[PDB]
């Protein structure tokens, strides 16, 4: 399993701003949204086999190929 570092050495990610929308466009309602957020809140602080399998399913083969190529480039640069 992967767990975050005790002191971060990188915070320049500067992610985008979360877009707000009605509950219907979300899981469906405030209660449903809260329930799903609570359900999925256990995976926030770690990365494991579930995340890897979801990534594989979502990236098929093209995503894995391109990600590994970029990782090889990064390793070569470093």
């Amino acid at each position: 399993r992967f767990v975050r570092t005790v002191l971060p050495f990188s915070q320049e990610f500067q992610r985008d701003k979360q877009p707000n929308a009605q509950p219907q466009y979300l899981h469906g309602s405030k209660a449903l949204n809260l329930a799903y957020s609570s359900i999925y809140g256990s995976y926030r602080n770690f990365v494991g086999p579930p995340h890897f399998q979801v990534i594989c399913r979502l990236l098929g083969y093209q995503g894995i190929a391109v990600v590994m190529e970029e990782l090889l480039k990064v390793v070569k640069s470093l």
Binding site: D16, N20, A21, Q22
Partner: peptide, 29 residues
């Protein structure tokens, strides 16, 4: 470049549907 384009190239009346969509979106934030 894609994220920069998406940020800058954002979105840009006498249609009832548009007016209603405005009221409900305003009742939200």
């Amino acid at each position: 470049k894609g994220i920069q384009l998406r940020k800058v190239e954002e979105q840009r009346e006498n249609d009832v549907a548009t007016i209603l969509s405005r009221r409900i979106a305003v009742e939200y934030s």
